[PDB]
Design a protein around this ligand. Sequence first.
Ligand SMILES: NC1=NC(=O)/C(=C2\CCNC(=O)c3[nH]c(Cl)c(Cl)c32)N1
Length: 272
Amino acid sequence: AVPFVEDWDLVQTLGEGAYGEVQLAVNRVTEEAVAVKIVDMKRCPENIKKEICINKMLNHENVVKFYGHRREGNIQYLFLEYCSGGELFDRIEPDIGMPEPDAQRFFHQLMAGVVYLHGIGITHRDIKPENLLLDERDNLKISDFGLATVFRYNNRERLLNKMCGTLPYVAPELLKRREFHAEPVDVWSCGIVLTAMLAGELPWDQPSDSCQEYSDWKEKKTYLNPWKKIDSAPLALLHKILVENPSARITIPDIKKDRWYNKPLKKGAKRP
Ligand SMILES: NC1=NC(=O)/C(=C2\CCNC(=O)c3[nH]c(Cl)c(Cl)c32)N1
């Protein structure tokens, strides 16, 4: 049955995940390219088990596909969809961002991915441009479920309490409340991601009053960067997403109803 078809050559290092190193693997026979996350369990053999477990639950066009996994001694292997376009992080130009239409399309795809995840009761907990990958047609794919967890099971929501994520992207309730709903936390990070795509800079080191840029936002001083670089329509959406009270924060079903979210901006990919 086609010899050598299970042999892959590691041709280059693509990056680093929350729990491992990622290599580009090319099939010896088909030349099919996949990404292989390699994790030396000599650190934590369980954290990686959970990630593999969450990946097995997923199947969506906006989520990095999980092909399988193999354990070789004290080395865990995760075969994942290769996204030749790289990290969204690298499409954001420092202090400028990117064309609004591109940002809107990536945001539409990010939302699609998050709606899907939240739909099966999984929260990512570390949404940031570094973890949002682009395939060859610039389709966005959510990656790295190393910090992901189940927040709804048997139709019962479980409140979270683990401080998790990346400070610039984390919701303020993680810093001031002991327990919190999972979903608004992911919405918030998507909000910070939109700000980065549209302004090329993160608004604050963290969402605490001790942080001046953050109090400035709560005061509505949008005449300052990064907000002044953002057009009124998407800024209006950001005023709904970046709300301190998680209960008053806009939900995804409503983001989908937002004026900017539905504004025709981007033409489809050019055709011959
Ligand atoms: N953060 C992260 N988790 C992953 O599984 C992951 C992958 C694996 C998913 N596919 C990729 O093409 C990829 N490119 C780069 Cl750069 C990284 Cl790193 C990856 N990146």
